[PDB]
Amino acid sequence: INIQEDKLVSAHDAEEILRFFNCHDSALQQEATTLLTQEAHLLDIQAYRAWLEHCVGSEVQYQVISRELRAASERRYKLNEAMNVYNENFQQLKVRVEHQLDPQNWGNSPKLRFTRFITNVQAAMDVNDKELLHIRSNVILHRARRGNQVDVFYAAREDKWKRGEGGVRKLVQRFVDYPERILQTHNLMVFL
Amino acid sequence: INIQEDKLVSAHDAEEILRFFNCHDSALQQEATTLLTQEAHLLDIQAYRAWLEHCVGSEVQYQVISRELRAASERRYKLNEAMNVYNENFQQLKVRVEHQLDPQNWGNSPKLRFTRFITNVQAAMDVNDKELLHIRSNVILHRARRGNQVDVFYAAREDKWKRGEGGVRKLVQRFVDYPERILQTHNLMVFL
Amino acid sequence: INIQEDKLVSAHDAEEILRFFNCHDSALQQEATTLLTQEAHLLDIQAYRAWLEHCVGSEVQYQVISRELRAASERRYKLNEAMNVYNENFQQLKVRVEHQLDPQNWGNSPKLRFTRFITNVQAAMDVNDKELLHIRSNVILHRARRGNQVDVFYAAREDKWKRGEGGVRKLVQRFVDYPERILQTHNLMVFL
Amino acid sequence: MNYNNKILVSESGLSQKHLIHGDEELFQHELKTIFARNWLFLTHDSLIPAPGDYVTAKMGIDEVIVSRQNDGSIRAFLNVCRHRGKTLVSVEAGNAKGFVCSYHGWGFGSNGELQSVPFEKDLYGESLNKKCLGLKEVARVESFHGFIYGCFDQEAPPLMDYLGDAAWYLEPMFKHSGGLELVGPPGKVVIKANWKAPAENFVGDAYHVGWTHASSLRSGESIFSSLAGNAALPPEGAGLQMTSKYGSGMGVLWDGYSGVHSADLVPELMAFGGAKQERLNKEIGDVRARIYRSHLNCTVFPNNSMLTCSGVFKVWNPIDANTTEVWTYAIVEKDMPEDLKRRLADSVQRTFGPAGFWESDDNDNMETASQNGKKYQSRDSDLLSNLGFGEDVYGDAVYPGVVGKSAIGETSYRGFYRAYQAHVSSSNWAEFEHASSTWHTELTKT
Amino acid sequence: MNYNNKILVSESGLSQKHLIHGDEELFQHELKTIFARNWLFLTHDSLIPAPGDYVTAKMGIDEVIVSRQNDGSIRAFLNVCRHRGKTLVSVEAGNAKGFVCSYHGWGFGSNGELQSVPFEKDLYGESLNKKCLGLKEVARVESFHGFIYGCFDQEAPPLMDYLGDAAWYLEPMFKHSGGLELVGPPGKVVIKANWKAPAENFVGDAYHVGWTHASSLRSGESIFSSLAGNAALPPEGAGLQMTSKYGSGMGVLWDGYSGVHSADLVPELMAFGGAKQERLNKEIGDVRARIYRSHLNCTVFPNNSMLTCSGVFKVWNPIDANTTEVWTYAIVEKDMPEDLKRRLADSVQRTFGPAGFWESDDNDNMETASQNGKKYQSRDSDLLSNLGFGEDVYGDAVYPGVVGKSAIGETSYRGFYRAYQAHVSSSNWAEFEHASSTWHTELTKT
Amino acid sequence: MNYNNKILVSESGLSQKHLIHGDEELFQHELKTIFARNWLFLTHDSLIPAPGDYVTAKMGIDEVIVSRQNDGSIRAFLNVCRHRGKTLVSVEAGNAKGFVCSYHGWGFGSNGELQSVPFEKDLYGESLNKKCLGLKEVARVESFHGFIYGCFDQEAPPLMDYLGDAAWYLEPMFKHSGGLELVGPPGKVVIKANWKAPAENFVGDAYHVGWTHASSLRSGESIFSSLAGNAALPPEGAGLQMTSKYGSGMGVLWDGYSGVHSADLVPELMAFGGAKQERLNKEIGDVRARIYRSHLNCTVFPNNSMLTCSGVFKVWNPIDANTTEVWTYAIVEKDMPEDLKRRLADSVQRTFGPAGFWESDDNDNMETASQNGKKYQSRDSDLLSNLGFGEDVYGDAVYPGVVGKSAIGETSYRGFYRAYQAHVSSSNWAEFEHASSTWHTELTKT
Ligand SMILES: CCOc1ccccc1
Numbered sequence A, B, C: 001i002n003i004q005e006d007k008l009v010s011a012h013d014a015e016e017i018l019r020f021f022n023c024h025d026s027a028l029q030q031e032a033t034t035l036l037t038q039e040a041h042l043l044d045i046q047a048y049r050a051w052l053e054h055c056v057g058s059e060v061q062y063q064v065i066s067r068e069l070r071a072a073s074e075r076r077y078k079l080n081e082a083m084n085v086y087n088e089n090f091q092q093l094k095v096r097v098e099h100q101l102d103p104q105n106w107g108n109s110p111k112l113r114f115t116r117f118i119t120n121v122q123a124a125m126d127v128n129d130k131e132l133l134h135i136r137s138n139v140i141l142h143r144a145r146r147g148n149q150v151d152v153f154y155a156a157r158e159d160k161w162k163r164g165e166g167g168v169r170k171l172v173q174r175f176v177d178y179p180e181r182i183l184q185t186h187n188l189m190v191f192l
Numbered sequence D, E, F: 001m002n003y004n005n006k007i008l009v010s011e012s013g014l015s016q017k018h019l020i021h022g023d024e025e026l027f028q029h030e031l032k033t034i035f036a037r038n039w040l041f042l043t044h045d046s047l048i049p050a051p052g053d054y055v056t057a058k059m060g061i062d063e064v065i066v067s068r069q070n071d072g073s074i075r076a077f078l079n080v081c082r083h084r085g086k087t088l089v090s091v092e093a094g095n096a097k098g099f100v101c102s103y104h105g106w107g108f109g110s111n112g113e114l115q116s117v118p119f120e121k122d123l124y125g126e127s128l129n130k131k132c133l134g135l136k137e138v139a140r141v142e143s144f145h146g147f148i149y150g151c152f153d154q155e156a157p158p159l160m161d162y163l164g165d166a167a168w169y170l171e172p173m174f175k176h177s178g179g180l181e182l183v184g185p186p187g188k189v190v191i192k193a194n195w196k197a198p199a200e201n202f203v204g205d206a207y208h209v210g211w212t213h214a215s216s217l218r219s220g221e222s223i224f225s226s227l228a229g230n231a232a233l234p235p236e237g238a239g240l241q242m243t244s245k246y247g248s249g250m251g252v253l254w255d256g257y258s259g260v261h262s263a264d265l266v267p268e269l270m271a272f273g274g275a276k277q278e279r280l281n282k283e284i285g286d287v288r289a290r291i292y293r294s295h296l297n298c299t300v301f302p303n304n305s306m307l308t309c310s311g312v313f314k315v316w317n318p319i320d321a322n323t324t325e326v327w328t329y330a331i332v333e334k335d336m337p338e339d340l341k342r343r344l345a346d347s348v349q350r351t352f353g354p355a356g357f358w359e360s361d362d363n364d365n366m367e368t369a370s371q372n373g374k375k376y377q378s379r380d381s382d383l384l385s386n387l388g389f390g391e392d393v394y395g396d397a398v399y400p401g402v403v404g405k406s407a408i409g410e411t412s413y414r415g416f417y418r419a420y421q422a423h424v425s426s427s428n429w430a431e432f433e434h435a436s437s438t439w440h441t442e443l444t445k446t
């Protein structure tokens, strides 16, 4: 991809493509699929403590941004391009998990229902850090509550996973650039 | 998963996780994916007789429940927790298939359009019944009819599949706990 | 499938089933998954030139139809059954790509956001043309723009792919019979 | 629109303006003159049997909490906090001595009383009159053999009087059978139809069965199966239709005890109902014992319907003129074996629940008939309900109410819509009574 | 709002209140004074050529069945059962001798008559007057060279008179070319715009083309391509604009026979149109033969638009003030080779269909202009259509109607909105006529 | 509804009819009497610092372009083209000397003037009066220490006077701290609540904190954490409440400088605020220096709210009676270290942004309280705001405004709704003034 020719493509996106088009390790794509499916299962059943213990690295950055709408031709205005819907370290994720599990979280009664659909899994080892696994995947996340509330979230996830305690591969970075600028889901209080 | 610590997790859900976290048979996950993709294809093209013949075991229980919304802290009220949207044996499925195929089913003209998306496939052999295959998968089901009617269904499926006539693996149990309490899809007249 | 017994099944759909139920080549299903995931990635980041160069054959027919609603029992009325939402050769796709990339395409500022979910991948080599690969897959396509516009598309894709320049497998035919008769997405200006 | 003057339903209930299924201003008017005035189904004893047991229910578009009191009575309250109006209870059923609001923590008893206010002494001192801050209570709550109905209007007739002549037909199954239980939880589905579309269908529409349900009749092998595709008309004397002063009505299909249930339940049911009928002959007489095991398709005005014997129990909860939330329960006879109760409940849902294949046959009929009521060229058009007009009777020696002595007709449509029009054009119960002083004469004209 | 008095369109059609694109009360008023009163496009002979052939169409928000009769005529009926109002036909096209309702099985003929009622003798006896129960018929159905229009108002002018001065411009392509065929089925897409937004754009908006369609012009290589990004203005005498008494109008772009079609069709089309023009010179004269192969962007009031030569044919079906269902067909000349007809039809859809890249350029323009009509500070603001005012003529020796002798202007906006305002403020056709007795004088002021 | 006469808010603001959160006719009336009349938040200097910088903002349901002029001033204009009404700007922020419409290419300056019209000479000649075709300008645009507000009504009081007694409380943080910056872009989320629900909550609701936010208090370890689950009441003298003539009000929680921020920020913030307070003692006195580092929960009437020290800045943009688009920015003190500014901004979003765990606790409270306002039995019910009534003062020697000298009460609800009712029942500012001539006396009764 030449971004001078493919005018709509960002430098970042072009860099991420390059990562997966090179070495294709089919066994790695399969491992990544398993990892993400198990992660999604733990989240769907609201096993948030198990998710932290089994899926999330101590050095994690868990980040979801919302990018301000700017002109395609904009070249002068240079103030903060995005805000962080999430930008969490492990302790901040733990706070959110405790908030979910608190018996006085009134919004969690009656119990919520989550269903996640993970697709388009791609995986590649980092060139320089042979222990760093890049995983890309897309998620549809369905949240249902209180009879007739239904919220559906859609996103692409750029992950880095690394082997931690016990040799278990854990999430050390998740980056999502959320595609909808104005949320129509009441909130983004879900783990993408 | 310790459900005393992970307070939001049900005993049933914790049991189902355990099933897949243990032995991982990659070839089995692939077989299960094929099985479910072919099943979904037959259903999407409305080959309901072929679905029964090729995908459904004679001993099937095909069950979709709707669970009443109760307090997370509820401990006294013990009446029927759920109703059965579906709870069908093979003959009852056959009745529903004949209803679909009847030329006086006016609702089927003009012909409906179905598109199924199956994701998050997990598979594990039963410990005790070496011929029983547990398969978990999620479905998005899109149904379109009559110009501008569009209904989208979302669910997790807990299946058991077993080799039957000709060595063909067939569905012997499907269990779905439907995530939306009040349906906003006119009906649930689709095979999840 | 006997379409005299399975009354709801079209001859075309029955023919397409037959194609995949026969030889199952697991390695081919995996190759097809990679091909479609990479294609969807290029499209999602709006690398339309890269998509043409890497994914689309010079002899392509890219076709999306909308079928008129007719009675299931209709047997006399024989006028044009469908119109072509798309029916493009390579040059016509190139025109559409140039339209997307034009700096005076006002609708593309601020930049659109695309997320594709590809599922249900099936693959089979053609019997007669040993170099022709049949691939079937389903797509959910999420398009977000201008703060609060969200359009979600759902379709099954019948593809033919063939090795072209450099031995690279490229799309030589895509056929989609769009399931919704009246679009509720403002337009169908997306590459399914 | 002037509801005092506008003829929405013609004399004798012979026709109705199609706009009644689509007009949002009229829907809003119905909230006042139909739903705030009449008796509405809440729950059954079987779902809140013990002190502290509660459920939520809709009454029109309002939501209420329905609670078993310590003294064994039932009281119902708006599910709305008396402070800043937050919804008090977010679940469908449970057991509690009270309900605490999640906004500022006000605590209400199961009896609706404001019992506790956080830090009351420090904040309000003695100035908060909690005695005047109890939950807004449903004025009237009464039982018909375990079936609990509510009414916001203190001036309503007692529930038994409101049922009028329909009560006589319901009693063999509701009372003399030993009693019914409601099996919950209900299925819940939103349809794009006016609440009146399914209400009118259940109250009096036997005509549609052979054609609408042709595929379900043919596929399911139920006892009414000979009707599939209008292949056969029920014989003379196969049944009757009735209606009543306050709008409730039903069809009676003689002996149809297995109802819509598939052949898998037919022998067991036909044995069970026949055995109980034999006992009831001695108690209530042959005719009423036969009514017990006869299929009744009934609407309790305005929006509660049922199929006895089939065991289908429906609430058509209004949302707007083209939106209705359908609640579906199963009814079973208390003295049935538990395994039969379970299979009957599943069969009710199989046929008429969220994935009920029979219920699905009706969808397009109700939805399009309702939505057409909004279309410009149809608003002022006339929906017809004249079948059997001029052959109804009143005061029959055997069968009470306005009665059409035929299985298929529109007798019950006429009585339903006569009562509907009398309510819509009246400001209170006294005016309804005045508008209804010749109700049966109007229905039996010609 | 008082529609007798409210000035929604200023004198000479120079401006319109922005609220006209957003106000739901006015939309409801338009159902009566625009859609129930005027001629609306239904179908073409080519889509229902044989006896029994039918299609469904919208007329305003109403749906009709349009059926070829045994005698070769066409009749149209509300798609609503005369019994309980269910939608009769659920398909878009077919062939049948009649239509049976899926609710209670009433059978109507292709001629709208109630022909059969299930078990009529046993149920109704002789009491059902089927002669008075035929489907509600569209009062007026007429053809313009195969193009079939309907009108609910018996008092409307004949279709030919209603087209007024626009007919003269359409005739070379619609009549003298040997005739057109409509290629179905249409694309169907919902846009979030008022029906008037695309109607006004097609009737008279050449100004937007170079800027709105800059990317499509540059990318597609059509003959109008020099306009991309306002790089060039059409030369003097490149075209004209016209409008008429009953609101129909169009732009004429001289010689533009290949229209919006990409270079792949340009040589073939320019050859074909030029060859037919050479023959037509002898028949209808040089000017009218030239009009035949000139690009016409036309709206037939109120909501049917077209681009001749490009072959685009549109219905802007109203749903609510900010919702329109867009139907897109292709028109082709009957004597074109079949392969060219096929490629032309695909090209119409490629450019202006559901994934029409030209049509997509217009989306934000129509949607936001319409939605802004609901915004508080814009409701009472004035949309401007004054371009070319004071330079229009009437009664020209060569070109009839109110005519602006320039390719780009707002002449046709003014005539469209003059007719619109006269209808909105009138209760019937006689009042429209009274309000229109000086229509051309009003348009040519200054 | 007659807004001149209808008592929507009772005397002294003691209660409000629940319908105010649900009634769409009243919402439409608020567009005129609340949003077109009062000062509304637009942006901050920090987001448009250089000439040509612009942002889009909502003012009620209208959208405006807010642009930094070459002379350093700010002007705001309706985001609507003066030609055919298309939305001019489709982005949220940028830098430009002008805005060109994508429909017909009209070019407007950053100063709102119509500067260019494509092919003007050839099309319009000299006839287009561009001087009368500038964008519709917001009549009043003023700054409060960098915070830019707009008002459509030329008759409004100056922004400083409009803030009334609230300004005194805001000044230590907004002015004396050296100034604030707004960190963009904002989070944007739609909630199904009336705009008044979050507005009233932020203006005066300390009561809800311990119970509503029990889980966030317990989980986050912020300084207000002792309140979790109503485990503890703030001590006497922990804070106060205030309100003002034009409706703005706030709670003051003494010394709470780290606000809702988790323990990870508490030590740094408490050090920073305390150090600045020590300097401010000498400048503005001990009381006002203490107010600087005290947590203020404030609503600037009608729909702009904030938590100082926490740094949360909110706009509750109205969509309809049960729909609000919530914009969330962070405010930081300019002289904070950049790394602290960054962490503070992330923490604001973490707690109160689109995935703000605190903000999520409030969702059901605001949404259900608002939606219940549509329910038939609740429309005419009374929302209570009587806590602390009869203990408020006015004209205090130290703390200005109508003041409740307690941390928890409903003083600010009363002042908010008193101003709301005075606006709703008035046709202009002069009438509001007349209706408000005894505003503080009404609030301090008993
Ligand atoms: C009337 C609604 O459905 C029925 C009616 C009668 C018998 C069976 C089903």
Ligand SMILES: CCOc1ccccc1
Binding pocket: E201, E202, E203, E204, E205, E206, E209, E251, E260, E295, E297, E307
């Ligand atoms: C007017 C709508 O679109 C047009 C107009 C004129 C020429 C080509 C396209």
Ligand SMILES: CCOc1ccccc1
Binding pocket: F201, F202, F203, F204, F205, F206, F209, F251, F260, F295, F297, F307
């Ligand atoms: C009032 C809205 O939220 C608050 C209020 C006070 C303190 C912290 C949070």
Ligand code: FES
Binding pocket: D081, D082, D083, D084, D085, D086, D101, D102, D103, D104, D105, D106
């Ligand atoms: S709203 Fe219920 S306690 Fe305040």
Ligand code: FES
Binding pocket: E081, E082, E083, E084, E085, E086, E101, E102, E103, E104, E105, E106
């Ligand atoms: S509604 Fe058509 S036959 Fe009854």
Ligand code: FES
Binding pocket: F081, F082, F083, F084, F085, F086, F101, F102, F103, F104, F105, F106
């Ligand atoms: S609408 Fe803006 S230039 Fe015409």
Ligand SMILES: [Fe+3]
Binding pocket: D201, D208, D209, D212, D213, D358, D361, D362
């Ligand atoms: Fe039915």
Ligand SMILES: [Fe+3]
Binding pocket: E201, E208, E209, E212, E213, E358, E361, E362
């Ligand atoms: Fe255009």
Ligand SMILES: [Fe+3]
Binding pocket: F201, F208, F209, F212, F213, F358, F361, F362
């Ligand atoms: Fe709060």
